[PDB]
Amino acid sequence: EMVPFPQLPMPIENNYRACTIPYRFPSDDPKKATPNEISWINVFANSIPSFKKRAESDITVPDAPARAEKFAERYAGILEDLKKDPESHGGPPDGILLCRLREQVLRELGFRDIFKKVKDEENAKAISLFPQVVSLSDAIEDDGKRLENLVRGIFAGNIFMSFLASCQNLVPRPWVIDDLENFQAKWINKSWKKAVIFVDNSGADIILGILPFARELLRRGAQVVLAANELPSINDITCTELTEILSQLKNGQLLGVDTSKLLIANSGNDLPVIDLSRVSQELAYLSSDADLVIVEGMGRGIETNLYAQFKCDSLKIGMVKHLEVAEFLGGRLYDCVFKFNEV
């Protein structure tokens, strides 16, 4: 069904490990949850009120409020189970498991996209601003400063008073991981011809952060594949929705830029993080000749994949939105990670 992402060096066995932050070592007592496990279980438990509120007002679901209560109860219980017995529910837990358990409880109860209304609203608002935001980057004369502005836009989108205001209020550099000078140096040779980008959120993120950047790549002669979730997870953009957005924004051009080398791919993913050892054949086919792999957002690029080694150049770019993640990295809440590995 699924296959390894082609830019992972083979053998991936005993080399690729998706999850970045370990919670347990083999020598730890197997019958007692560890401190990191308790910490991270608590992160997920602390998400329950927001997910319950969103679920309960999902009017597309009959008797959403009762179902949302059952979600909050069932997921809270699974999490307390894991604190008492790390081997329960398919543990010991890692970030992928905790994410997946949350999605399963919701989906079993018949929820399919509790964020759909808000996603649609945020996409609509962003689409109205696309020409304005793109104009501002197009106005910048120097190609390297333009890149920097687009990179700041990716970070701002990944948190978003306005999107453009947020571009100007990022934490000051140096960033916690700051490889932008190196990346800019290579970008100005125009040496990349095949970019693959694992996208994250709907709304400003995909439309005002990612898409202008993608457009700049196209303009500089690169092919760009945008890889998105198959299934809804939180407010993350799915392949289906991104196809609709592109149709909406497009002489089939994006503000005078041809999109014949812009491809939208279903990654096969259904979480807010990603295990790159299991991606769709569609994506594997479209990524078999990639020479830049970009992984966006804290879930896909930081909590997973931050230290993943690729056969080609790779960039992990995202804003830090968990204190526990900031702690792990020795950075600030809202710190920016721009981690670039050449060769």
- Which one of 58, 236, 275, 296 is in contact with Mg ion (CB under 5 A)? 236
> Beta-strand (E) ranges in 87-204?
177-178, 194-198
* Of residues 196 and 325, the one with the C-beta less far from Mg ion: 325
229 marked ligand binding residue = no
Q: For the stretch 312-331, what's the b/e string if a residue is b when 16 or more beta carbons lie within 10 angstroms of its beta carbon?
A: bbbbbbbbbbbeebbebbeb
Q: Looking only at residues 124 through 143 of this chain, which bind Mg ion when binding is defined by CB under 5 A?
A: none
Q: How far is 4 from 195, CA to CA, in rounded Å?
A: 18
Q: Nearest approach, Cβ of 60 to Mg ion (angstroms)? A: 21
Q: How far is 150 from 137, CA to CA, in rounded Å?
A: 7
Run of H or E residues at 265: strand 262-266
> Beta-strand (E) ranges in the chain?
177-178, 194-198, 223-228, 253-254, 257-258, 262-266, 292-296, 313-319, 336-341
Per-residue x/- mask for Mg ion, residues 199 to 228, rule CB under 5 A?
A: -xx---------------------------
- Dihedral sign, CA of 309, 302, 79, 109? negative
Which stretches of 250-319 are DSSP H helices? 281-287
* Of residues 209 and 272, the one with the C-beta less far from Mg ion: 272
236 marked ligand binding residue = yes
Residue 299 binds Mg ion (CB under 5 A): yes
Pair of tokens at residue 157: 């989108």
Q: Nearest approach, Cβ of 317 to Mg ion (angstroms)? A: 13
Q: How far is 16 from 96, CA to CA, in rounded Å?
A: 14
Applying CB under 5 A, the site for Mg ion has a residue count of 5
Residue 113 binds Mg ion (CB under 5 A): no
Q: Looking only at residues 43 through 72 of this chain, which bind Mg ion when binding is defined by CB under 5 A?
A: none
Q: Nearest approach, Cβ of 119 to Mg ion (angstroms)? A: 11
Parallel/antiparallel/unpaired status of strands 336-341 and 313-319: antiparallel
Stretch that binds Mg ion, among 63-71, 196-204, 219-227, 325-333 (CB under 5 A): 196-204
Stretch that binds Mg ion, among 48-56, 171-179, 229-237, 284-292 (CB under 5 A): 229-237
Residue 241 binds Mg ion (CB under 5 A): no
Note whether 341 and 314 are within 8 A (CB): yes
Q: Nearest approach, Cβ of 155 to Mg ion (angstroms)? A: 14
* Of residues 92 and 299, the one with the C-beta less far from Mg ion: 299
Q: Nearest approach, Cβ of 233 to Mg ion (angstroms)? A: 7
200 marked ligand binding residue = yes
* Of residues 155 and 187, the one with the C-beta less far from Mg ion: 155
Tokens 């990670």, located at residue: 337
Best CA proximity match to 175, nearest among 25, 9, 326:
326
* Of residues 33 and 325, the one with the C-beta less far from Mg ion: 325
- Interacting residue ranges for Mg ion, rule: CB under 5 A: 200-201, 236, 272, 299
